[PDB]
Amino acid sequence: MDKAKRNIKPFDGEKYAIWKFRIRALLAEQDVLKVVDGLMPNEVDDSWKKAERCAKSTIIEYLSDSFLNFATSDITARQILENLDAVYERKSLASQLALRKRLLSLKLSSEMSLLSHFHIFDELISELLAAGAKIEEMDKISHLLITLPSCYDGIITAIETLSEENLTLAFVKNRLLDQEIKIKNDH
Amino acid sequence: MDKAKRNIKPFDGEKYAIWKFRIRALLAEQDVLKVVDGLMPNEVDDSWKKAERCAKSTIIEYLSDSFLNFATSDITARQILENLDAVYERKSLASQLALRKRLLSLKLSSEMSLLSHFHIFDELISELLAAGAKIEEMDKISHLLITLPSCYDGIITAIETLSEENLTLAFVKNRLLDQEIKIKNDH
Amino acid sequence: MDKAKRNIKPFDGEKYAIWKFRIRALLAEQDVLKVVDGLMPNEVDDSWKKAERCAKSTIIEYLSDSFLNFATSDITARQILENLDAVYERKSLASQLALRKRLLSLKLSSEMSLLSHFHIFDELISELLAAGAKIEEMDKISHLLITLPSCYDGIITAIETLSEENLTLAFVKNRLLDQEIKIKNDH
Amino acid sequence: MDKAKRNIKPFDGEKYAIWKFRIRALLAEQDVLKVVDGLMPNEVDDSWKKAERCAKSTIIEYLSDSFLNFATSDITARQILENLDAVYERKSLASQLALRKRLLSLKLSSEMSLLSHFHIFDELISELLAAGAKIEEMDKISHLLITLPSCYDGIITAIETLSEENLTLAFVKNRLLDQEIKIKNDH
Amino acid sequence: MDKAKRNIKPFDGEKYAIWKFRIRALLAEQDVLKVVDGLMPNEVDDSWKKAERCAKSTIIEYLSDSFLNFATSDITARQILENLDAVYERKSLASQLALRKRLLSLKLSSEMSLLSHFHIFDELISELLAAGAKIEEMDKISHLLITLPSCYDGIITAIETLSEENLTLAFVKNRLLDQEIKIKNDH
Amino acid sequence: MDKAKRNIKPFDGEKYAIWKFRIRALLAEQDVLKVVDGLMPNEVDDSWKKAERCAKSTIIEYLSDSFLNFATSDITARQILENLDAVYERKSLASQLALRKRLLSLKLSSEMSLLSHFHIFDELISELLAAGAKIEEMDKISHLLITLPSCYDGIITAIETLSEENLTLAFVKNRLLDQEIKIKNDH
Amino acid sequence: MDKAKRNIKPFDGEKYAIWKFRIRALLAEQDVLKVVDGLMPNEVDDSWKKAERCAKSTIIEYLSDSFLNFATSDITARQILENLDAVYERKSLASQLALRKRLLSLKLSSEMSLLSHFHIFDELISELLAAGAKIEEMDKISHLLITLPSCYDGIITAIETLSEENLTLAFVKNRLLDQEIKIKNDH
Amino acid sequence: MDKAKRNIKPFDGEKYAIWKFRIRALLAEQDVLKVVDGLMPNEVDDSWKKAERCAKSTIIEYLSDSFLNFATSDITARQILENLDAVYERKSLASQLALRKRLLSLKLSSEMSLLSHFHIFDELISELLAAGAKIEEMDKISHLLITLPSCYDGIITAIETLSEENLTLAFVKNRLLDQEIKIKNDH
Amino acid sequence: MDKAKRNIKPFDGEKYAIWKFRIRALLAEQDVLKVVDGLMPNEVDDSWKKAERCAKSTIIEYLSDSFLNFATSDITARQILENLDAVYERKSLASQLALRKRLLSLKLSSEMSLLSHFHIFDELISELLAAGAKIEEMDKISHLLITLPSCYDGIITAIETLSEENLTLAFVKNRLLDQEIKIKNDH
């Protein structure tokens, strides 16, 4: 059976925890997830052996060569996950406040290169996926909006109305295009 | 059958309906309002007479010198209310039309704070009601909208793109707070 | 069961959350809050009717003309709650926008007493979450933390790593007070 | 009965009838108005003793210093009131004639607000009722009409051709107020 | 009996009451006053025919030429008199209001004998009684008394000190004659 | 008797003693005066009523119009004359006193006819009697005498201890005219 | 026993008559006066004890510190009354002399409100009685009249005819208010 | 017990005996003074605890924060008061000497009103009693006499011979104030 | 029973230790302190639930806006109070370090009356013990020796003679007040 290649890259970097959590789902349909989760049975069937082989192979496909050194030749998938967890794991503290302190540093930029500001919020989403997970686009759009110039101050808050009912952040970006449109049009 | 101190300043002629329904609610709190509410009761007795006499006493608590002159003991409580109506609340067509003329004329450029204009609209509407006009949410909305300049007119654009059923004059003041909050901050 | 003065004032809709909270505390002390929240009996007895009329009267005492003229004669205090909740507590993102702007408004330099900014922020965020904000407590402190000078850098640059489960509202706020008291003393 | 200060100005001999009427209304709130108005049994049941002395002190609260000695500690509050009635309610041609010219000499200019005119007219009616005589209705009408200023002249000219059922004084007041509105519009 | 010059002024709208009074008296000397004041029986006897026709003829002789229209050769003297009654005695508010306007307008100028002033005053007073407006004894007293200048100050003050039942119109006039004497004397 | 004009005038408030004297004289020669000579008896018959009404009519003929205010419709000619008397005759201490001041002030100058001087004395007498003075024959005489210049002293000497028996005021006028004639020669 | 918020000033040595008398009236309404004044036997029961304590407290809070020495540990309410009456009142003859001198030197300067002078006079009189004088109504009247200025003096000359039995001080004061109003007219 | 406003202050030491005496008087009216000054019943009375706590609260409202820390929650409020009294009001020989020497210095330069320095002398008397040198009538009299100003010392020359039994210090103050009135009368 | 005015501030942390002391005393007055100081009772009957509710509502009466929002109705008023206590009453090492620094820097000053000095010392100590420093009578006295100026050397040595049987801040303060008064006198 071919392993359907995913744009989830072979882990080498941030949150093996989330990456491996999504790998657990990838393991679950072959259910080699069950064998790595499962007690090493008194009866290791050929199915269990094949599942362990497959799991290690999946890990390899999903791990960078530097991490493949931890994989080594035949160390069980479970043992390698444990080693990686032990070395890697800082459990709780860093995750939200890394995003937060980055937002403190990465905010309040209303005028210079609004397209770089597109990239700014893109980095913010990246940081949310990476470390910050508490609240979603309503708060994001709120501070992004506050980040920016006067036109929203007039329109958004009342006049734009419950456009949040649609939550068309796409049209919000298009409103930034409209800012650009007006800027060129006035001259 | 207890009474407490009053935010109501002893009545003087203006906010007559406001003060009057405030007093109505007070009298209903003592249950005594029923005497004015009902037609000639079947239970015309010292207790219903006590209820209306207490009502008269309560009215006299607010009546100032001219009002206390209306408060001749012979006149029934309901009759006194009717007298005060005929002075203040009297439904003159001329009053309604004159107030309509004045509201057309009355406008805000910049010289009245948002709350200043809010109360201006409030008094205008209140008087037009007291003059005996019959008025609806859309009327209040449109007139208040019409009073304003272009910055605020972005709110009118909000109404054209917003369901009028959700619009209420309280909510309109709310939306108008939001609109002038743009001017404050946007400056 | 007391009618003495309160900081409660003929309300304007401004500070509605705490205003209403003090109102509710009062109404429970008036004992009418029980009926105002409690199941309305299918037969609204004079006990319940008294308690409603009393509540409405107290609300009248504590409300301005605007809400009371918005308050129809027959609407129960419940409807008054609902009206004010719709006006204030529709929780459109616009509230969050305004609150984040007011949060941004003061950067707490080394001048102001830190307790001033503590209570300012505390109020601000309390109302922000009263506006339905799904914000984590450390994510609140984070906005205050934006406000601090370089003197703080020595602690803050670590403490941004030392975060929600490690340090919570009290723990961080105390650590911040430790830094600022030391800043003052050192100065 | 706690007597938190009511709508009663103190007393120093001025506008006795009406001020005492405020007192009477208070005594009905005290329920003790029965002691003066109702028969006072010299039995004076204990509730009556307390009521009588309570009334006496209540009056005294509003009484000025001279009025304490006018109200000697022996005479019943009813007797005190009756004494002050003889003292103040000595309705006299001195008062009647002085007031009658003082009032007839006062004129409604076309400037002074017709609201103020109503208060003037009602005051003077009640003054002439109080001073030792009553007033005939058509004479009230006549005096009112005499007060009026020149801008009315055409309207008065029309009015003088209308009989009393055509000129029911309430409608006269109202149509003249509508004429005031017209005049204001013209200005 | 003769048509000896019965020198009434032929009436023209002037002194209608007085004119009609002289006429009534005149006809009574002819005994023909019965033709009108006696609502005639079915007895148009030759005496009554003469009485009526002669009365009519004499009324014409003491009516203005303009007035002969209301006195066409057909109707009986009563009808003519009711015509003029409706002209004057319709309770003309114009007459009443004009009468009081002038009454109130002119103080006693010291250029006229107080007796002449008295006659003038009483005459327009009697005209205002005839004009449809009641006049009270106290009204008459007030008007007369304050229509005078200050030199009266001695009786003016004495009036207040003095009692009501003494100061009748006749007694007031007597005291006014005392003061007239005293004024002429003072010069 | 016929109303052929006697030596009487439409009354003017003046010579009222003489006017009334001649009126009474006419009424008595008409026999009609019996109605004011007698107070209203049980004998109010048709003759009495008609005589009274005719007296009033005749008074009206001899009254000028203002005095018709005394005539006043209904009141008897007896009452009308009583009111007239009170106004002109107007008996009071000050009245005779002021008239006495004038009288002693009086002096004769020859260019004033002695009959001119008679009439000034006689009008003073009319006033003084009408004012209520009980003027003796001797008073009339001596106060007339005081005025006369030295030439009169010859006849005046005929009074000092010489007989008053002849000296009735008619005879005193005879003496006065006698000395006047002597002095007419003398001039 | 409702301790109403009596306007009674916290007294400290000025107009003790007024203060004490108001307090006495309060003791009468408090009903304590019966026990406070009655006697001091061993029948000073729990109600008697609490009544004298209540009165004592009332006195203390309505008095100043000056009394707390006079409060002589535990003198009951009555003993406090006598002590303070002796402290201020003591039938002081020197006070009578000073009060006479003040009153005699005193003159109503017309700008001093008629009320101002009236209470000044009433204060002098009340003090002079407390100083132990045998004052009478005639004294009060005479001094009051004497104390006024020239226009009032002329109207006093009118008032002089009003013999003592005609007059009572309250009535006279009222006539003097009427006279002041007359002066408003007169000027 | 009633909670009516007492003229008693949050206390830090100012007029210690007097403030404490006001407190004591209130507590006696609260009935709680009985335990505060009196017995320590062995039985565990609920009313005793309620009274104590209530009194403590009252005194706390009446105390400054220093006295509150002295007011240890777990001990009787009374004990705290007596302890504070001892600290403040112990028998200091030094205080007595200072009070005597200030009394010598307090030879009054009588710019101050005389009664006021009597009050101040009473304060010093109270202080010297509290300082431990409780004084005797003769001594108080001597000291008071010595303190007075020049013409007052002139009367003291007479006063020296006065009979010692009649010379009660209360009578002395009476006599001195009477002489002050006499001194201003003599001026 | 209902709460009177307590001058206890609508609070925000200023003088929190003693403010909370006053609060706690008021809770004890209501019997509700048992539930606050003790656990929320193991079975919170209506009495205890109402007791804690009353504590909360009174804390609301005495709190200010952010302090009210901290006072959310969910968690017991005692818990909230403790939360705010730890916030301001930060019982952690640096607080006592800073306080010690402040104490050791502080000295008595001449204008700082020894009572005021004691007040300042005592508030410092109250803060220190409230900060949680285990510091007792010997330390209080030792700190007082440290603050005292050169004019206190001899008394300080006398206090060094005063050992643990003598150790009592009251007696110590008493002797220091003796020093102070003798200092005042001497200087």
Coordinates of N, CA, C and O in Angstrom, one line a residue, chain B residues 23 37 134:
Chain B
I23 N -44.2 58.7 37.6 CA -45.2 58.7 38.7 C -46.2 57.6 38.5 O -46.6 57.0 39.5
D37 N -56.4 54.3 36.5 CA -56.4 53.4 35.4 C -57.8 53.0 35.0 O -58.2 53.0 33.9
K134 N -48.1 61.5 16.3 CA -47.9 60.1 16.4 C -46.7 59.7 15.6 O -46.6 60.1 14.4

